[PDB]
């Protein structure tokens, strides 16, 4: 019943992505990712120590790290132009104001929002990776259900309880373009030797994460 994702602050995922994006070289980008992956695997073993048929895996993080491969969640229905409006309303921005204009007259959108949010209010987030996923789930469902009001509420929960850095990264997760500077093939290859292969055949991110959870146990076993 318990999940590693329920114990990991979204902020630690985001600070990892930030250091990855910020690294110049491939080796450094890999090192930041590997560190988070390795901790996740150590914690998984401590958490699920004496448990039976465990289905928990790295999927709740991996689906945020490779969001373009997201298949379980339907489309979010979220455009950068409407996030702009959501922030102007939420932050009580005057539309003649400098921050409002930056958002309206839209180095992606995530970065603009980031510069706007950085000097403001909340500096430390509270959400776990699981809670972020549960909320992205509501957003996707409510897009299918054609409930734009419930989408705004869920998004508002995600945004208001998160730091600027988390919001930058959340935005990129929703748009499905992290701009990390490391390929999907590289990410898969750090995770597991066989992961790129398994994903080719299954097109199934959760299956890959769960079946190849143990780096020393290959597809052939």
């Amino acid at each position: 019943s318990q999940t590693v994702a329920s114990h990991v602050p979204f902020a630690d995922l985001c600070s990892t992505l930030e250091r990855i994006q910020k690294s110049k070289g491939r080796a450094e980008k890999i090192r930041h990712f590997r560190e988070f992956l390795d901790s996740w695997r150590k914690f998984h073993d401590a958490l699920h120590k004496n448990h039976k048929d465990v289905t928990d895996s790295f999927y709740p993080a991996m689906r945020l790290i490779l969001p373009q491969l997201e298949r379980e969640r339907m489309a979010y229905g979220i455009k950068e132009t409407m996030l702009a409006k959501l922030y102007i309303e939420l932050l009580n921005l005057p539309r003649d104001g400098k921050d409002a204009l930056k958002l309206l007259n839209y180095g992606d959108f995530a970065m603009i929002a980031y510069f706007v949010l950085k000097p403001r209010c909340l500096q430390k987030g509270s959400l776990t990776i699981q809670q972020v996923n549960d909320l992205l789930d509501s957003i996707a469902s409510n897009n299918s259900a054609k409930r734009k009001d419930l989408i705004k509420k869920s998004l508002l929960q995600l945004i208001t309880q998160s730091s600027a850095l988390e919001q930058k990264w959340l935005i990129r997760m929703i748009i499905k373009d992290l701009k990390l500077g490391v390929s999907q093939q590289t990410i898969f290859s750090v995770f597991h030797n066989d992961a790129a292969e398994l994903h080719n055949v299954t097109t199934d991110l959760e299956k890959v994460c769960r079946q190849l959870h143990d780096p020393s146990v290959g597809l052939s076993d």
Partner: peptide, 10 residues
């Protein structure tokens, strides 16, 4: 016996 994430990463 519940592990704290902070002694694994944070």
């Amino acid at each position: 016996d519940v592990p704290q994430w902070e002694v694994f990463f944070k």
